[PDB]
Design a protein around this ligand. Structure first.
Ligand SMILES: [K+]
Ligand SMILES: [K+]
Ligand SMILES: [K+]
Ligand SMILES: [K+]
Ligand SMILES: [K+]
Ligand SMILES: [K+]
Ligand SMILES: [K+]
Ligand SMILES: [K+]
Ligand SMILES: [K+]
Ligand SMILES: [K+]
Ligand SMILES: [K+]
Ligand SMILES: [K+]
Ligand SMILES: [Mg+2]
Ligand SMILES: [Mg+2]
Ligand SMILES: [Mg+2]
Ligand SMILES: [Mg+2]
Ligand SMILES: [Mg+2]
Ligand SMILES: [Mg+2]
Ligand SMILES: [Mg+2]
Ligand SMILES: [Mg+2]
Ligand SMILES: [Mg+2]
Ligand SMILES: [Mg+2]
Ligand SMILES: [Mg+2]
Ligand SMILES: [Mg+2]
Ligand SMILES: [Mg+2]
Ligand SMILES: [Mg+2]
Ligand SMILES: [Mg+2]
Ligand SMILES: [Mg+2]
Ligand SMILES: [Mg+2]
Ligand SMILES: [Mg+2]
Ligand SMILES: [Mg+2]
Ligand SMILES: [Mg+2]
Ligand SMILES: [Mg+2]
Ligand SMILES: [Mg+2]
Ligand SMILES: [Mg+2]
Ligand SMILES: [Mg+2]
Ligand SMILES: [Mg+2]
Ligand SMILES: [Mg+2]
Ligand SMILES: [Mg+2]
Ligand SMILES: [Mg+2]
Ligand SMILES: [Mg+2]
Ligand SMILES: [Mg+2]
Ligand SMILES: [Mg+2]
Ligand SMILES: [Mg+2]
Ligand SMILES: [Mg+2]
Ligand SMILES: [Mg+2]
Ligand SMILES: [Mg+2]
Ligand SMILES: [Mg+2]
Ligand SMILES: [Mg+2]
Ligand SMILES: [Mg+2]
Ligand SMILES: [Mg+2]
Ligand SMILES: [Mg+2]
Ligand SMILES: [Mg+2]
Ligand SMILES: [Mg+2]
Ligand SMILES: [Mg+2]
Ligand SMILES: [Mg+2]
Ligand SMILES: [Mg+2]
Ligand SMILES: [Mg+2]
Ligand SMILES: [Mg+2]
Ligand SMILES: [Mg+2]
Ligand SMILES: [Mg+2]
Ligand SMILES: [Mg+2]
Ligand SMILES: [Mg+2]
Ligand SMILES: [Mg+2]
Ligand SMILES: [Mg+2]
Ligand SMILES: [Mg+2]
Ligand SMILES: [Mg+2]
Ligand SMILES: [Mg+2]
Ligand SMILES: [Mg+2]
Ligand SMILES: [Mg+2]
Ligand SMILES: [Mg+2]
Ligand SMILES: [Mg+2]
Ligand SMILES: [Mg+2]
Ligand SMILES: [Mg+2]
Ligand SMILES: [Mg+2]
Ligand SMILES: [Mg+2]
Ligand SMILES: [Mg+2]
Ligand SMILES: [Mg+2]
Ligand SMILES: [Mg+2]
Ligand SMILES: [Mg+2]
Ligand SMILES: [Mg+2]
Ligand SMILES: [Mg+2]
Ligand SMILES: [Mg+2]
Ligand SMILES: [Mg+2]
Ligand SMILES: [Mg+2]
Ligand SMILES: [Mg+2]
Ligand SMILES: [Mg+2]
Ligand SMILES: [Mg+2]
Ligand SMILES: [Mg+2]
Ligand SMILES: [Mg+2]
Ligand SMILES: [Mg+2]
Ligand SMILES: [Mg+2]
Ligand SMILES: [Mg+2]
Ligand SMILES: [Mg+2]
Ligand SMILES: [Mg+2]
Ligand SMILES: [Mg+2]
Ligand SMILES: [Mg+2]
Ligand SMILES: [Mg+2]
Ligand SMILES: [Mg+2]
Ligand SMILES: [Mg+2]
Ligand SMILES: [Mg+2]
Ligand SMILES: [Mg+2]
Ligand SMILES: [Mg+2]
Ligand SMILES: [Mg+2]
Ligand SMILES: [Mg+2]
Ligand SMILES: [Mg+2]
Ligand SMILES: [Mg+2]
Ligand SMILES: [Mg+2]
Ligand SMILES: [Mg+2]
Ligand SMILES: [Mg+2]
Ligand SMILES: [Mg+2]
Ligand SMILES: [Mg+2]
Ligand SMILES: [Mg+2]
Ligand SMILES: [Mg+2]
Ligand SMILES: [Mg+2]
Ligand SMILES: [Mg+2]
Ligand SMILES: [Mg+2]
Ligand SMILES: [Mg+2]
Ligand SMILES: [Mg+2]
Ligand SMILES: [Mg+2]
Ligand SMILES: [Mg+2]
Ligand SMILES: [Mg+2]
Ligand SMILES: [Mg+2]
Ligand SMILES: [Mg+2]
Ligand SMILES: [Mg+2]
Ligand SMILES: [Mg+2]
Ligand SMILES: [Zn+2]
Lengths: 99, 83, 99, 208
RNA sequence: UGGAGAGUUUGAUCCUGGCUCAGGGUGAACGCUGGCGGCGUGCCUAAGACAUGCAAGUCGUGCGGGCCGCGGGGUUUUACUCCGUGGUCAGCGGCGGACGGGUGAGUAACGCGUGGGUGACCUACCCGGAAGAGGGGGACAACCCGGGGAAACUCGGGCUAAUCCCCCAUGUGGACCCGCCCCUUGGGGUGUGUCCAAAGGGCUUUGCCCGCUUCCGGAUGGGCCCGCGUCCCAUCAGCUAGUUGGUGGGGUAAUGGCCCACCAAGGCGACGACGGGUAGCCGGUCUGAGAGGAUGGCCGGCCACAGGGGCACUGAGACACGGGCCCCACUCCUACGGGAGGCAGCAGUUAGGAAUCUUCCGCAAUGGGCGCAAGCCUGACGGAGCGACGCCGCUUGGAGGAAGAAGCCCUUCGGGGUGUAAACUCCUGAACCCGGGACGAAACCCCCGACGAGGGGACUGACGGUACCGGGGUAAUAGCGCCGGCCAACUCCGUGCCAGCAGCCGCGGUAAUACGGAGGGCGCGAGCGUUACCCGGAUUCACUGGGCGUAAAGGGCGUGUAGGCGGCCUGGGGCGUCCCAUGUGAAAGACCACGGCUCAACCGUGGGGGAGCGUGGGAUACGCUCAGGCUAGACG
């Protein structure tokens, strides 16, 4: 006895699963990189931070991880990584971090 | 978007319109941005249509969209005349 | 223009924060008498530069915390403990009227 | 309402001979020419000294019943006059005289003000060419109050304008008897009206 | 361009003092009465419960299909299959469902008003500007098959398209870390490193149109923050554990103790914290000479809410009225396992109540959503209906008509009154009867031009055969209150402290201008009264504008805290105070003028305003502050 705007609801569900996935990846990758930044493995740390930043921006392309909140996540990630490598040194791969 | 439309201000069976710049999302008799003219459809007085041409040109330059009736009334006032 | 007030530092017991008491004179809305009201503002002292009794200027600022929305612009005049003593006596009188 | 009913009983009660029938208030039949005492069983009895409210109320009632205007329109006209700038009484009299029915009476088209009201209400009177059937219509200085071309053949208008030959009109009015029309030249001054009413008494009556 | 008082304490007086009345107002209701029209207005109570219909969709110019039908093909026929086309149905996809509409619950609060801040922010569609769109891949519905359930619906397998999703490339540019410069909170620029772009469709078809992507700006809308203002009770005096602050994080578009860890012990309060009660707030509105008091309905602005409570998802935007989840109460279905529903959308039902409307017409107008467009949707809206609920206009006749019919009421029995009132005479013509008959409606669109400017053409009226115009044409609703004083209007009879009246004073117990009836009169009039409520008078909470010896009122006395107040002179500051300039003060309303409906109510146009607050500049007499001085106050 109701109208077909239920379609909208359906779509939202799909989009929900589309968003939760991407974020769930990003966070995960972030953690991983930070671990390698604590243990001093700078090459793999930066190599994974590159992919994390890429996923952040790609999620920002759509409505999942939209405007500059994505820049906020990138900022915090790169800051934490560079800070943790400074406790060890030798930024081997020279990836996302500027010279 | 911001639009240029008409607002009804007369009494019953006595329509009097204000050519007005307002947000489309607001009610047609609600708080508008600026009154840029007035229009009397029944032609009760010799001056039953007045438009501030420069202000209309400004609002069109910044991105206002007139209604078909509003655009017709503006065109009658030479808002678009480039002769 | 961001509001600029002038008051007395009556509490330096917090960290990076000072309690600036600000007075104001105005005619009564009905009885016309020039009456004097006051208000305490939590101002930001990021260097612990200002101490008790200092008469300082205060500027409207981006919120630092809940109830902390002002910064200390400059020092009007150095420590004059007379107004501080007045405020402390006004507070001490409250313990005398309980029951 | 219009108070419709006996009229010369007001000629009697007000103590001043009113002209509500037009004629027969000039003829020795007004009942004021022969019975000047107020109406009722207790009319011929010794009158007691009236109160101030009595005097002001009687004066206001005299001025109101002269024109036959209801209390609503009368009070509204008085408030309108008091809102305007100038002396309240003279402006009030000019407003009352500006009514279309009273102008028809003053222009000799009708013998009485109520006859003028019926002449207006039935569309026998035009203003600037356009037919107007409103007694409360306000005549502005310069308006030409004429008679309907379809009504100029009626017997009553023939009689009234046949008697208006040679009769003078108010200083603020002009009359063309052949064309059966007239003009409202200006608002009448207090000196122009010979009404037996003290306007200050009415102003004080509404001041309460 | 503005200000009235009166009655009432006494045998009489003056004062104090309360009570009452005359005024204006209403989203009113009730009684009696009730003719017409226009414009307004109409659940104030149960934010109680709701049958039923409608109220939010739209795009085939994003994509592939199912069903029904037709036409044309590959074939000799059949089978099978291809193309075109019509109707219909949903699906995938995009935009809209966050607007519009309703309501006053809850909220004493940055909720609102007002003035500012954002170097701490976002903004779909729209406008301007710069640049770009190369290649590849994938999935889920529809659909096909099977299962479970009474139903709602649900589960599994398989096929597939796209403006669906993903990868690589191009880096105009942007994002981030770090460094430098400028600027000064997170503003702007620059370098290296790293990371990020895209979608196609339609034709009048190789040229345009609707789009898409990245960026900068505009515009609009909004988020957050701050100064000041915003009811009653102190028979509420102490309140606070995320409490106050810090550091580091999480979170958001963004600050924040918003949230979380650890550390410090703070934060608030008689300048009224905390608690209780009440209440959306404002533009305004009512009243008032003003100051002020009261109020927040219609309309407009902001807020909050969508049976009660909580919560996230999706999205530029929601903690989402007609979206989703859970708990509670309720109603309905039920195979008792489980489900469905949420009028404070329009109308309507029922309950409560003194009381508040039609289950109407229309997409024509204005506005909104989608679409290239045609067009579709719109209980927004435009109209009509009902209700003297309000405001305004109008009618129930006009003129002549006796020293005066009758009836009725008084009466000195002479007469007086109802009263020119009536009957009557002449006249106009409310209603109605015909005929004509609208403005509101020219755009979108089409054609010319160049899908521009400009010109031309065509369609479309709910109201409604209504308004209005012409002709014809009948004398054709009046009621309600009052008549002792305040307060305008008096007699007769009945009644006998009875029956009753009464806003206040008061009236009636034999001859009542006060009761009841009659005659007469007074006041208003399609109204008149009553009740309730607000302001008024009321200078009766007295800022303007009161008082305390005896009328209500000086604390039993002191000491003294906070607070309030401060002799004379000079100078500095310019906080109060004052002045100039400027911004702000939406519209409607109010005021003034002109104009449009035959007037008015109603409405349009223009004009004038204005406190307050922000900013810049100026003045220094007074109040303030600082520095110094004096001795008349004070103390020694
Ligand atoms: K304490
Ligand atoms: K007396
Ligand atoms: K399936
Ligand atoms: K670069
Ligand atoms: K902006
Ligand atoms: K005042
Ligand atoms: K919703
Ligand atoms: K006729
Ligand atoms: K054209
Ligand atoms: K006629
Ligand atoms: K009796
Ligand atoms: K009586
Ligand atoms: Mg839908
Ligand atoms: Mg849809
Ligand atoms: Mg994980
Ligand atoms: Mg809006
Ligand atoms: Mg013109
Ligand atoms: Mg132009
Ligand atoms: Mg101070
Ligand atoms: Mg400290
Ligand atoms: Mg902090
Ligand atoms: Mg006057
Ligand atoms: Mg005046
Ligand atoms: Mg003066
Ligand atoms: Mg003067
Ligand atoms: Mg006594
Ligand atoms: Mg006595
Ligand atoms: Mg005595
Ligand atoms: Mg009253
Ligand atoms: Mg009243
Ligand atoms: Mg009835
Ligand atoms: Mg009734
Ligand atoms: Mg009506
Ligand atoms: Mg209505
Ligand atoms: Mg209600
Ligand atoms: Mg109310
Ligand atoms: Mg398209
Ligand atoms: Mg099909
Ligand atoms: Mg076939
Ligand atoms: Mg065969
Ligand atoms: Mg479809
Ligand atoms: Mg709304
Ligand atoms: Mg409370
Ligand atoms: Mg504010
Ligand atoms: Mg506040
Ligand atoms: Mg503000
Ligand atoms: Mg977009
Ligand atoms: Mg976009
Ligand atoms: Mg653009
Ligand atoms: Mg594929
Ligand atoms: Mg495939
Ligand atoms: Mg493919
Ligand atoms: Mg489905
Ligand atoms: Mg298949
Ligand atoms: Mg599958
Ligand atoms: Mg570059
Ligand atoms: Mg790339
Ligand atoms: Mg895409
Ligand atoms: Mg591709
Ligand atoms: Mg081509
Ligand atoms: Mg607290
Ligand atoms: Mg932070
Ligand atoms: Mg968000
Ligand atoms: Mg907290
Ligand atoms: Mg923090
Ligand atoms: Mg205070
Ligand atoms: Mg409280
Ligand atoms: Mg409440
Ligand atoms: Mg007034
Ligand atoms: Mg006022
Ligand atoms: Mg209020
Ligand atoms: Mg409201
Ligand atoms: Mg409102
Ligand atoms: Mg309900
Ligand atoms: Mg609920
Ligand atoms: Mg709820
Ligand atoms: Mg969107
Ligand atoms: Mg989001
Ligand atoms: Mg909400
Ligand atoms: Mg919800
Ligand atoms: Mg609903
Ligand atoms: Mg459901
Ligand atoms: Mg009932
Ligand atoms: Mg209605
Ligand atoms: Mg319909
Ligand atoms: Mg429409
Ligand atoms: Mg339209
Ligand atoms: Mg309507
Ligand atoms: Mg009337
Ligand atoms: Mg007569
Ligand atoms: Mg006749
Ligand atoms: Mg036309
Ligand atoms: Mg159309
Ligand atoms: Mg062409
Ligand atoms: Mg044209
Ligand atoms: Mg029709
Ligand atoms: Mg006629
Ligand atoms: Mg009297
Ligand atoms: Mg009585
Ligand atoms: Mg009363
Ligand atoms: Mg007797
Ligand atoms: Mg008697
Ligand atoms: Mg009597
Ligand atoms: Mg009588
Ligand atoms: Mg009434
Ligand atoms: Mg009163
Ligand atoms: Mg007062
Ligand atoms: Mg007074
Ligand atoms: Mg009192
Ligand atoms: Mg006083
Ligand atoms: Mg007194
Ligand atoms: Mg004593
Ligand atoms: Mg002191
Ligand atoms: Mg002291
Ligand atoms: Mg002094
Ligand atoms: Mg002092
Ligand atoms: Mg000086
Ligand atoms: Mg100053
Ligand atoms: Mg205004
Ligand atoms: Mg006023
Ligand atoms: Mg006019
Ligand atoms: Mg001014
Ligand atoms: Mg200044
Ligand atoms: Mg000076
Ligand atoms: Mg000294
Ligand atoms: Mg001595
Ligand atoms: Zn007479």
């Amino acid at each position: 006895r109701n109208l077909s705007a239920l379609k909208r609801h359906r779509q939202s569900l799909k989009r929900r699963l589309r968003n939760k996935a991407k974020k769930s990846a990003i966070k995960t990758l972030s953690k991983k990189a930070i671990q390698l930044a604590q243990e001093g493995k700078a090459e793999e740390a930066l190599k994974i931070m590159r992919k994390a930043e890429s996923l952040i921006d790609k999620a920002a392309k759509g409505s999942t991880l939209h405007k500059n909140a994505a820049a906020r996540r990138k900022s915090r990630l790169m800051r934490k990584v560079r800070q943790l490598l400074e406790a060890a040194g030798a930024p081997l791969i020279g990836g996302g971090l500027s010279a | 978007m911001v639009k240029i439309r008409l607002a009804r201000f007369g009494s019953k069976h006595n329509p009097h319109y204000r050519i007005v710049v307002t947000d489309a999302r607001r009610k047609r008799d609600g708080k508008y941005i600026e009154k840029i003219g007035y229009y009397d459809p029944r032609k009760t007085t010799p001056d039953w249509l007045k438009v501030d041409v420069e202000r209309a040109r400004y609002w069109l330059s910044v991105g206002a969209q007139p209604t078909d009736t509003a655009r017709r009334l503006l065109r009658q006032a030479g808002v678009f005349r480039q002769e | 223009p961001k509001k600029v007030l002038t008051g007395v530092v009556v509490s330096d017991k917090m960290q990076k924060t000072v309690t600036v008491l600000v007075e104001r004179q105005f005619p009564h809305p009905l009885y016309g008498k020039v009456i004097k009201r006051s208000k305490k503002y939590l101002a930001h002292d990021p260097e612990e530069k200002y101490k008790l009794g200092d008469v300082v200027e205060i500027i409207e600022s981006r919120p630092i915390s809940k109830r902390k929305r002002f910064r200390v612009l400059r020092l009007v005049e150095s420590g004059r403990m007379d107004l501080v003593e007045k405020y402390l006596i006004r507070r001490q009188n409250y313990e005398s009227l309980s029951k | 309402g219009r108070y419709i009913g006996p009229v010369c009983r007001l000629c009697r009660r007000e103590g001043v001979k009113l002209y509500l029938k037009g004629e027969r208030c000039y003829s020795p039949k007004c009942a004021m020419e022969r019975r000047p005492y107020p109406p009722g069983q207790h009319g011929q009895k010794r009158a007691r000294r009236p109160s101030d409210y009595a005097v002001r109320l009687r004066e206001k009632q005299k001025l109101r019943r002269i024109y036959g205007i209801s209390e609503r329109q009368f009070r509204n006209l008085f408030e309108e006059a008091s809102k305007k700038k100038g002396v309240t009484g003279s402006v009030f009299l000019g407003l009352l005289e500006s009514r279309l029915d009273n102008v028809v009476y003053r222009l000799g088209f009708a013998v009485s003000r109520r006859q003028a009201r019926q002449l207006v209400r039935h569309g026998h009177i035009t203003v600037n060419g356009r037919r107007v059937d409103l007694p409360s219509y306000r005549v502005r200085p310069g308006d030409e109050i004429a008679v309907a071309e379809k009504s100029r053949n009626l017997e009553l208008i023939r009689q009234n304008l046949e008697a208006m030959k040679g009769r003078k009109v108010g200083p603020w009015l002009s009359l063309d008897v052949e064309g059966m029309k007239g003009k409202f030249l200006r608002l009448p001054d207090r000196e122009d009206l010979a009404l037996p009413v003290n306007e200050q008494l009415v102003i004080e009556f509404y001041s309460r």
